[PDB]
Amino acid sequence: PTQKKKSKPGKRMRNCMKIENDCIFPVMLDGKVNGYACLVGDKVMKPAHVKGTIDNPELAKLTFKKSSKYDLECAQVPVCMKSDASKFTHEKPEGHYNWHHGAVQFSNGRFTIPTGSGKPGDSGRPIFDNTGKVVAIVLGGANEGARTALSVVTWNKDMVTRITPEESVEW
Amino acid sequence: PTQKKKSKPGKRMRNCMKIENDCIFPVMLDGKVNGYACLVGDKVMKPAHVKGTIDNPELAKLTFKKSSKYDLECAQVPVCMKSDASKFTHEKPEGHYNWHHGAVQFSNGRFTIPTGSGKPGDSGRPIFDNTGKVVAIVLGGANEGARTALSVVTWNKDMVTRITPEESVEW
Amino acid sequence: KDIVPYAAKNDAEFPSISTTAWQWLATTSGPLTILVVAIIVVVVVSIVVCAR
Amino acid sequence: KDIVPYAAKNDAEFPSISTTAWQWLATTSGPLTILVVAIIVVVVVSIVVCAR
Amino acid sequence: ASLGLLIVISSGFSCFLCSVARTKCLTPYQLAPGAQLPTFIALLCCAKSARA
Numbered sequence: 025p026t027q028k029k030k031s032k033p034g035k036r037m038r039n040c041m042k043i044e045n046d047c048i049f050p051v052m053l054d055g056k057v058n059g060y061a062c063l064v065g066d067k068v069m070k071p072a073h074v075k076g077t078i079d080n081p082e083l084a085k086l087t088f089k090k091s092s093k094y095d096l097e098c099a100q101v102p103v104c105m106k107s108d109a110s111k112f113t114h115e116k117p118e119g120h121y122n123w124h125h126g127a128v129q130f131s132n133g134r135f136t137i138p139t140g141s142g143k144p145g146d147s148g149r150p151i152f153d154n155t156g157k158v159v160a161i162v163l164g165g166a167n168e169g170a171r172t173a174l175s176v177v178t179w180n181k182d183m184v185t186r187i188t189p190e191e192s193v194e195w
Numbered sequence: 196p197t198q199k200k201k202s203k204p205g206k207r208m209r210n211c212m213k214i215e216n217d218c219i220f221p222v223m224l225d226g227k228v229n230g231y232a233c234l235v236g237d238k239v240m241k242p243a244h245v246k247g248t249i250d251n252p253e254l255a256k257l258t259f260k261k262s263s264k265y266d267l268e269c270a271q272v273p274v275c276m277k278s279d280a281s282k283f284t285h286e287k288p289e290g291h292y293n294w295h296h297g298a299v300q301f302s303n304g305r306f307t308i309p310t311g312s313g314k315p316g317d318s319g320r321p322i323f324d325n326t327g328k329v330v331a332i333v334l335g336g337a338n339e340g341a342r343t344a345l346s347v348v349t350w351n352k353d354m355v356t357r358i359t360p361e362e363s364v365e366w
Numbered sequence: 367k368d369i370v371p372y373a374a375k376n377d378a379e380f381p382s383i384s385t386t387a388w389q390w391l392a393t394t395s396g397p398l399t400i401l402v403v404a405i406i407v408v409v410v411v412s413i414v415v416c417a418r
Numbered sequence: 419k420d421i422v423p424y425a426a427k428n429d430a431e432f433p434s435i436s437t438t439a440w441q442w443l444a445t446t447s448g449p450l451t452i453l454v455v456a457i458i459v460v461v462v463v464s465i466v467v468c469a470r
Numbered sequence: 471a472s473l474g475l476l477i478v479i480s481s482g483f484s485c486f487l488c489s490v491a492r493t494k495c496l497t498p499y500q501l502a503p504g505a506q507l508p509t510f511i512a513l514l515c516c517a518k519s520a521r522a
Binding site: 304355 | 505506
């Protein structure tokens, strides 16, 4: 059958655009990428591996009030920092299969991607969606089966402050 | 050219391009538009951008009982005024796009528009769903970094008055 | 002097400590009681605003 | 050490059982209030992780 | 002895309180977000007073 309405481009002449655009920033300490920063949610949550690794020095000094028990921030940053980061989250899309890896399955309480990188300073990168909402922040993962199980801190409409699989490496 | 539901006869006598209202009146002060009046609902919610500009001296004095700590007025106006009065709002639609301009998406508990609005003289126009239900009246705004967080007074299903990220200033 | 007889020592309210004295005094109580309620009604509306 | 008579028996508190001895003893509630706050917070974290 | 005891109640209360404020943020966030609800505010008032 056909489409009997449109509210957007009915057709295309080539592909030269990308469906979602990253907004991430790598973050340096001794000139090395030891995480990725973004400044997301309503109240701002990122630090777990960018506690040490500076976003901007002023910003580092400014933010901290934390639950260092599980490493979750409950302090927030300016609007200035916030616009330049990935889009904010308040709900969980689970229909998303694009960020940086080819498919994101949520089943059996675990996020998986197919067998990927798990090399130093890949930690703290957000898992961004097709409307760029951040569903999870990578703490690490461990490869098994043909998939990579991920360890995450979450905050959407449903939330667990640090949760880990049976087997894990510190990425 | 059959569509799902025809909403034009194939002619420019009905259009899908509306973006303005006919319940607006600008209210002058020093020869400058420092707001707009419309006398919204039957228990009239307006002065917060048109408290210092007013509409005419007589309607204001008569009407005005307020909760000046959030600057919302409560009080009925007569039959004359009510006949041309905007829509009564007591419910909240989710997701909006028109007000005057081409976005007022309501997600993450924020309305945002692109940078190049929040200008006064264009402030006081209601945020409409294409039925003239007003969830908030736009008072001013603040630039986030690439988007503009907006200054509002709301009253729909719930109050939660002056939803802002952490501090925006009326302009 | 009340004019009903009343006599109680060691403090006397001027008509001493009596039912009638206690009853008349009960006025003072009124603003204080309502005052606890008044605060609460003010507060709950504020919680909504703050919440976002 | 004012002086005000008190009993000279039974428990050892060193002016013995006294309104003053009891009033000094009433620190005992302080350690209990700070303990109730610790119990609640320790059990409540464990409960959150489980809750969601 | 009694004078030293009072100081212990203040030292223990204050230090614990601080830890309590970080759990007060955590629990309703994790529970069921918690990002726009009035629920956060009741717990939050305590937490603001603790941290500052």
